[PDB]
Design a protein around this ligand. Structure first.
Ligand SMILES: CCCCCCCCCCCCCC(=O)SCCNC(=O)CCNC(=O)[C@H](O)C(C)(C)COP(=O)(O)OP(=O)(O)OC[C@H]1O[C@@H](n2cnc3c(N)ncnc32)[C@H](O)[C@@H]1OP(=O)(O)O
Lengths: 391, 8
């Protein structure tokens, strides 16, 4: 189910067993669905015959390559099966080893004979602030199962084991994003797309030539300046971590679903990593960092095309503004993404993004992204109040 | 960006 009222006809054999609100009920309360567990099951769940759980050590170049191969061939694809995500192995380390990570939270499923890797689910620790409560949670990401093994009960087995792994560490809530519709989204966010290299997107059928438009006008409509216009804009470095932390912490207090990051976590998620995360800050004439922007790089493999293979994309992260308008900040981000060789710039409609989306030639996309909270009952909010970005 | 979307 991709649209919400098509989920109404469905019935959930597994999500009616889990402590999540029902899709129909209105939520007027703020609290857990079930009590914290006194005893936690000690034995891993039973995988089907010929399969055994593992714990991938991503510090191994060989195991990480296995994880990249598993995701590169079996991860998320578009609705028409044209594009598949292409997370970098260096990207995976960035998003699977933040401060506090645990090896048993990189759960993998292997075949006993081949020792091949046919599944994966992940969990990293995250301090999440939801409405007026601040809860120690985990972010579930990279739920993958091999294509040959699909549609045979293996997905609900992955969810129960990873829950058991995190229940053993005292954490009983969780947060995660998905495109499908499940009980029950606390927020729904629409993707928007800004084309930096419109020639390639049209050739690979990412977008189509609009109503009554030539390529020459479209090439000249989406063109961008050479260099950024904002004064004193430069990449982030070590000396900028404490202030960038301080800027994001106050900026987020207006939204209702945000993270709570320590100075070590801010350094991890925002310090520039080439081909993974790009952060730029704005330093004024008094030597004060007053604004910053950020985007991360996630390309996807172009399928069944003889000449075009990859689709380089940049995803808007967190952009905090205090003395520079958000409109100028995001415009220079497009220019910065154009200089680095991106073909498209994707951004959600969460936070204040709906103010600059239309004005900066962003095109509204087909897909929806849902936000979920495990074991937390709270009233659903609007997309303008979401302040949480995951990879 | 966790799920895939194209311009419409
Ligand atoms: C305290 C700690 C709590 C931790 C737990 C928090 C929960 C975290 C939840 C994890 C979400 C993390 C989000 C991400 O990481 S993003 C996940 C999206 N990933 C992909 O699409 C990658 C490619 N697809 C796949 O690998 C397969 O399609 C998967 C493995 C996803 C299922 O393909 P398969 O054909 O093998 O399925 P099945 O027949 O075994 O079983 C089908 C059952 O699974 C339900 N299903 C399908 N997709 C999702 C989904 N994306 N989130 C939750 N449930 C999903 C489905 O509606 C049905 O439920 P129901 O019909 O029984 O109701």
């Amino acid at each position: 189910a991709k649209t919400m009222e098509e989920a109404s006809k469905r019935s959930y054999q597994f999500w009616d067993t889990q402590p999540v609100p029902k899709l129909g009920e209105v939520v007027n309360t703020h609290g857990p669905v079930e009590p914290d567990k006194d005893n936690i099951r000690q034995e891993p769940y039973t995988l089907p015959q010929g399969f055994t759980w593992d714990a991938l050590d991503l510090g191994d170049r060989g195991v990480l390559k296995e994880l990249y191969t598993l995701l590169n061939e079996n991860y998320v694809e578009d609705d028409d099966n044209m594009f598949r995500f292409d997370y970098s192995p260096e990207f995976l380390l960035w998003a699977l080893r933040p401060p506090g990570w645990l090896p048993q939270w990189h759960c993998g499923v292997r075949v006993v004979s081949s020792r091949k890797l046919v599944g994966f689910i992940s969990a990293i620790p995250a301090n999440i602030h939801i409405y007026d409560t601040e809860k120690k949670m985990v972010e579930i990401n990279f739920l993958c199962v091999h294509k040959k093994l699909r549609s045979k009960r293996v997905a609900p087995v992955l969810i129960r084991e990873i829950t058991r792994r995190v229940h053993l560490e005292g954490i009983f809530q969780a947060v995660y994003t998905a495109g499908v519709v499940l009980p029950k989204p606390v927020g729904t966010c629409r993707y928007w797309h800004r084309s930096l290299n419109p020639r390639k997107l049209i050739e690979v059928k990412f977008s189509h030539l609009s109503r009554n438009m030539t390529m020459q006008r479209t090439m000249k409509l989406y063109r961008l300046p050479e260099t950024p216009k904002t004064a004193g804009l430069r990449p982030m470095e070590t000396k900028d971590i404490p202030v960038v932390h301080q800027l994001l912490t106050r900026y987020l207090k207006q939204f209702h679903l945000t993270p709570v990051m320590s100075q070590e976590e801010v350094e991890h998620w925002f310090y520039p990593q080439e081909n993974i995360i790009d952060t730029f800050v704005v330093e004024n004439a008094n030597g004060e960092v007053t604004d910053f922007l950020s985007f991360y790089t996630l390309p996807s493999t172009i399928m069944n095309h003889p000449t075009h293979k990859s689709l380089k994309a940049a995803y808007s992260f967190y952009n905090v503004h205090t003395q520079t308008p958000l409109l100028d900040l995001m415009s220079d981000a497009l220019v910065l993404a154009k200089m680095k060789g991106f073909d498209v710039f994707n951004a959600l409609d969460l936070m204040e993004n709906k103010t600059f989306l239309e004005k900066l030639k962003f095109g509204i996309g087909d897909g929806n992204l849902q936000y979920y909270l495990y074991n937390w009952k709270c009233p659903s909010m609007g997309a303008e109040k979401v302040g949480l970005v995951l990879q | 960006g966790n799920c895939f979307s194209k311009p419409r």
